[PDB]
Paper text:
Conformations of both α5-β4 loop of active site entrance and substrate/inhibitor binding “TSGNT” loop are altered in the M120A and M92 AM120A structures. On-rate binding constants of mutants of HiM120A, HiM92A, and HiM120 AM92A are ∼286-fold, 80-fold, and 200-fold lower than that of HiCS wild-type. Similarly, double and triple mutants of HiCS (M92 AM120A, M96 AM120A, and M92 AM96 AM120A) with M120A mutation also showed significantly reduced quenching. HiM92A exhibits approximately fivefold increase but in the M120A background, M92A mutation fails to reverse the effect of M120A. Only M96A mutation is able to reverse the negative effect of M120A mutation (please compare the affinities of HiM92 AM120A versus HiM96 AM120A). Results of double and triple mutants also show that M120A background mutants display significantly reduced catalytic turnover.
Residue numbers in the entry:
A (entry chain X), B (entry chain X): 2 to 311
Write the structure that this text describes.
């Protein structure tokens, strides 16, 4: 069991039972912070590169280009370094100095775009670079690339199934790209055949999944739950496998992550607190009392030291 | 496989083969950054608390007190939170704001001591607090507590043995408390019976193991390789199982950690770069060409964002 490079070491993350949430131990969390670059995105950074290699879209001589400084940028960075690809990431010039150092340390060619143009200015610049030589540059597109939910169907989902001996009843996951809840739900419902409850979590400040499913005007808004609440329905969110949508506010997400640290000894990130807050509400309904609830914790506390978390 | 609290999830860390170090793949690293509080010390924080419980020295009503803000303080903090103990950690008032926030976030009662008195002022204050009510306070003493090397003999060592199918020939580990190399070496040499080469790594700036074994005056000195080079021979370093001592300088340790990030996609800490630098030198000697060399990487890059690493 020696991995040929760090990308093959993804996953096999632990399940830990919560003591101060839920009722009689019915809430258990999956620690995706224990991954090669310390988030859930390490899995999709690995598999989007692997699938592009298998497809012949990524070859020696091609460079990865993408517009993300978040967990997926870190994930693609370590995978590019591990497997020998140059990578260019675009981000607004306003990103934190700590994240510039981290990405630069991983060997990223960091292209800083105009601060006033935000995430759109970064996406545009990435698309411009790709336009300049499309036989040279590959953009992996985490919100629509099916290799994102596929790796969760092949690893994350089966890990939950095996570690719970098939007893999982509910999966609770915040939705960023949708890949996690989509792949996990397809694995458990379709490959293992168990009719669990799949719960998407989104910010109450930007409840676009709730609004969509209710037929209401979609009205996104700003929030502090980094990693979820993108303000649109991503292609990699399979709405057909979502059974329930829970909304969580930013303050309670933060307070819940702080409780995970101080009361459970779990170094969880902000969206981890959002997911547990939604799971805790379900776990304290009598209809969920005999149900085993598994919660994805996407990231780790030290990635948030300069945030409202601390 | 649902852990009753985060302390039981320690270990089972991956081995990754290096591509830009060594010769023909003979250097493989063990990623101790993938642990509950993201370092090798998570194992000893867990087991020193467990053994104190078994010994009856730690009970409900007793509080942990120790003098460390480093990886062991973080480890004891998450374990204390996970298992329901109050913990007080003393540290000089000069510690980084980021580490105060991290320890405070984990629920630590942080007692800041006089900056001019350094680590000794913190150890004194911890011993004073324990003196004030010894039936109430427990100090676990990582440099002398045998539960430190014991957990490496029971987990870290057998993991290396199993993941290499018994083919490991050399173990390379920086020495802080000595617990890692001591426990790993006892496991492989005594429990599995293989006569491997155990290599301690220390700073060239503070080469007290080398000086001791040579019968020379022990002369410690300052260095930047956080986590190793304590300036004395700890009780938990079993010199009898050390076959070789390699010295590494701070600059090369830093440069090697940066290479691990940018060339291997491995988010290693500073002492991880020191250990790989020493392993790389051995791996390029013809006498080590057919030998499988396993290197402990104690911690992860983001714990070092405010250091010379970045």
């Amino acid at each position: 069991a020696i991995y040929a490079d760090n990308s093959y070491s993804i996953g096999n993350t632990p399940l830990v039972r919560l003591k101060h949430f839920g009722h009689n131990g019915n809430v258990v969390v999956k620690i995706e912070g224990r991954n090669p670059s310390y988030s859930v995105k390490c899995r999709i950074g690995a598999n989007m590169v692997w699938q592009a290699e298998k497809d012949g879209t990524l070859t020696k001589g091609k460079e990865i280009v993408d517009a993300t400084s978040g967990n997926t940028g870190i994930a693609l960075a370590y995978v590019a370094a591990a497997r020998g690809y140059k990578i260019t990431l675009t981000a607004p010039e306003t990103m934190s100095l700590e994240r510039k150092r981290l990405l630069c340390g991983l060997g990223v060619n960091l292209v800083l775009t105009e601060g006033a143009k935000g995430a759109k200015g970064a996406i545009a610049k990435a698309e411009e670079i790709v336009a300049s030589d499309p036989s040279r540059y590959v953009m992996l597109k985490q919100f629509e690339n099916p290799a994102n939910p596929q790796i969760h169907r092949e690893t994350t989902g089966p890990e939950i199934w095996k570690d719970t001996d098939g007893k999982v009843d509910v999966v609770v996951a915040g939705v960023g790209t949708g890949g996690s809840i989509t792949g996990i739900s397809r694995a458990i419902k379709l490959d293992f055949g168990k009719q669990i409850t799949s719960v998407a979590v989104e910010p109450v400040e930007s409840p676009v999944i709730s609004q969509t499913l209710a037929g209401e005007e979609v009205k996104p808004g700003p929030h502090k739950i980094q990693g979820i609440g993108a303000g649109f329905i991503p292609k990699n969110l399979d709405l057909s496998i979502i059974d329930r949508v829970e909304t969580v506010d930013s303050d309670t997400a933060l307070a819940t992550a702080r409780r995970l640290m101080a009361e459970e000894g779990i170094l969880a990130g902000i969206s981890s607190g959002a997911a547990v807050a939604a799971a805790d509400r379900l776990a304290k309904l009598p209809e969920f009392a005999d149900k085993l609830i598994v919660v994805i914790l996407p990231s780790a506390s030290e990635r948030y030291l300069s945030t409202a978390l601390f």
